[PDB]
Amino acid sequence: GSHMTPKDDEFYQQWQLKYPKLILREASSVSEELHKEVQEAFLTLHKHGCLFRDLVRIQGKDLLTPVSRILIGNPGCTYKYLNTRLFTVPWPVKGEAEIAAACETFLKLNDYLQIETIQALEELAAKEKAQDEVDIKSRAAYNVTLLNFMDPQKMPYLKEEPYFGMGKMAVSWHHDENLVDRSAVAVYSYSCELEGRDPDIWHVGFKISWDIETPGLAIPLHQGDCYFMLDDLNATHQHCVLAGSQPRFSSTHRVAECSTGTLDYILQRCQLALQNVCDDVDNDDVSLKSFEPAVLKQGEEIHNEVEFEWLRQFWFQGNRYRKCTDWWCQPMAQLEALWKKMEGVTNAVLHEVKRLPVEQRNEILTAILASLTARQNLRREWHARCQSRIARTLPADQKPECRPYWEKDDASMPLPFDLTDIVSELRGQLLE
Ligand SMILES: CCc1cc(C(=O)NCCNC(=O)/C=C/C(=O)O)cc(Cl)c1Nc1ccccc1C(=O)O
Ligand SMILES: O=C(O)CNC(=O)C(=O)O
Ligand SMILES: [Fe+3]
Numbered sequence: 001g002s003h004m005t006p007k008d009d010e011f012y013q014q015w016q017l018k019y020p021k022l023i024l025r026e027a028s029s030v031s032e033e034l035h036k037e038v039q040e041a042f043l044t045l046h047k048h049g050c051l052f053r054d055l056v057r058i059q060g061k062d063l064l065t066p067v068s069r070i071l072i073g074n075p076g077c078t079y080k081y082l083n084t085r086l087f088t089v090p091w092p093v094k095g096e097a098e099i100a101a102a103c104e105t106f107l108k109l110n111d112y113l114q115i116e117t118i119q120a121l122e123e124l125a126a127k128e129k130a131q132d133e134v135d136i137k138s139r140a141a142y143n144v145t146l147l148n149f150m151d152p153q154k155m156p157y158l159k160e161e162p163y164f165g166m167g168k169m170a171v172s173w174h175h176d177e178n179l180v181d182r183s184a185v186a187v188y189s190y191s192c193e194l195e196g197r198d199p200d201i202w203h204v205g206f207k208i209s210w211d212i213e214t215p216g217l218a219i220p221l222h223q224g225d226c227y228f229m230l231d232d233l234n235a236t237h238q239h240c241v242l243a244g245s246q247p248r249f250s251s252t253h254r255v256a257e258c259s260t261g262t263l264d265y266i267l268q269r270c271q272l273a274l275q276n277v278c279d280d281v282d283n284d285d286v287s288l289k290s291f292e293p294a295v296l297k298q299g300e301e302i303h304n305e306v307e308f309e310w311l312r313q314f315w316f317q318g319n320r321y322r323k324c325t326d327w328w329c330q331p332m333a334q335l336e337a338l339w340k341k342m343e344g345v346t347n348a349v350l351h352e353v354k355r356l357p358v359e360q361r362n363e364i365l366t367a368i369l370a371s372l373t374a375r376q377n378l379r380r381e382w383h384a385r386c387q388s389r390i391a392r393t394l395p396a397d398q399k400p401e402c403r404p405y406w407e408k409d410d411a412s413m414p415l416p417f418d419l420t421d422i423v424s425e426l427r428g429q430l431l432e
Pocket of ligand 2: 146176187204241251252
């Protein structure tokens with residue numbers, strides 16, 4: 001099973017006892033200035049068509065998200081879920097103009113929600129009482145917001161909530177991934193809008209992980225209400241979104257764990273790899289400074305990282321971002337040139353092996369074979385993922401592109417797309 005709403009007497013007390021880490025600040029606590037600005041920005045972004053269903057992966061299947069979405073946040077920052085790296089439409093941190101102003105708005109919302117979170121965490125530590133301020137400020141330092149939209153009347157059939165009779169679901173039970181440990185989440189909910197929950201009203205539901213005996217909580221969400229998941233709530237509880245009648249937007253502010261997920265990070269990875277390359281001039285004659293297994297391993301790993309975590313993730317989104325911003329165009333051109341050089345590196349390593357003394361040759365194979373086989377496997381999986389039935393139905397605005405890709409002819413490129421043959425020979429040689 002069952003569930004509790006504010007209609008139930010036990011709700012208040014389940015909340016007080018067992019969800020102290022969940023906070024609700026109702027629309028009343030937020031200036032009607034913000035509301036109009038935030039809500040106008042949602043409706044702007046929608047009109048311009050900045051929100052897209054993402055083509056994700058779940059249990060090995062290609063699925064559009066029920067929800068349309070866009071990521072806004074720090075420049076150069078990314079947020080990865082369900083094996084999809086979302087790139088940030090930049091907000092004006094220190095350091096179009098319609099779209100740009102919405103980004104400014106959601107930044108403004110971000111500052112607001114941050115201050116509320118710090119307060120609530122402060123009050124939460126004070127209750128626990130009956131280093132600390134460092135942790136707290138880091139756990140509220142939102143760097144992105146993932147905006148969301150669903151019009152439920154455009155969906156033919158919505159999933160029933162399976163455990164507690166909560167009715168129709170917009171988003172099923174999950175945790176938010178790729179967040180800093182014990183980091184908070186703050187949500188601004190914008191509804192365009194009795195046995196159990198009102199089906200016409202949107203709700204956020206919560207349950208304890210693993211547990212469908214403890215009745216779940218369904219929190220009504222009216223226009224401009226905010227909720228906060230504090231501390232370890234996101235990890236120890238699941239949440240879902242229960243649809244109502246009308247369309248509904250939301251802004252989900254998060255502290256993305258972006259240690260391997262910023263532009264600066266991956267640029268620096270590329271420069272590390274190219275330290276092994278004689279860099280007098282950019283030509284097709286790539287010569288490497290060392291052939292020590294560990295620097296070659298490292299090089300071929302970085303190559304994989306720029307190729308799959310960045311290039312193919314980016315182009316798989318058919319430059320959807322390009323409608324909103326141009327910010328990533330040059331960086332994705334620079335990463336591609338950096339990756340091209342690396343194809344040059346891999347060719348030079350293959351030249352060196354096919355020249356050594358076997359023992360030296362075999363240390364090299366051993367260092368690189370895992371990276372080359374992953375490269376082959378992930379290229380197949382990405383190529384396919386760009387071909388899927390569902391992918392081919394998207395509009396041209398959003399068609400997956402399989403960049404980088406080249407034909408077996410293309411003599412601009414020194415190695416083939418398909419590495420099967422190359423990988424075969426290398427394994428063979430190791431077994432000599
Ligand atoms: C499963 C529900 C869901 C989860 C999340 C999410 O970010 N989760 C991060 C961790 N991973 C998991 O939750 C699960 C992984 C797995 O089972 O492989 C985000 C969305 Cl938007 C979403 N919703 C849907 C996505 C596509 C298709 C239908 C849905 C739906 O909700 O029915
Ligand atoms: O904001 C909401 O409650 C709906 N969206 C999400 O929960 C999400 O994006 O994971
Ligand atoms: Fe969520």
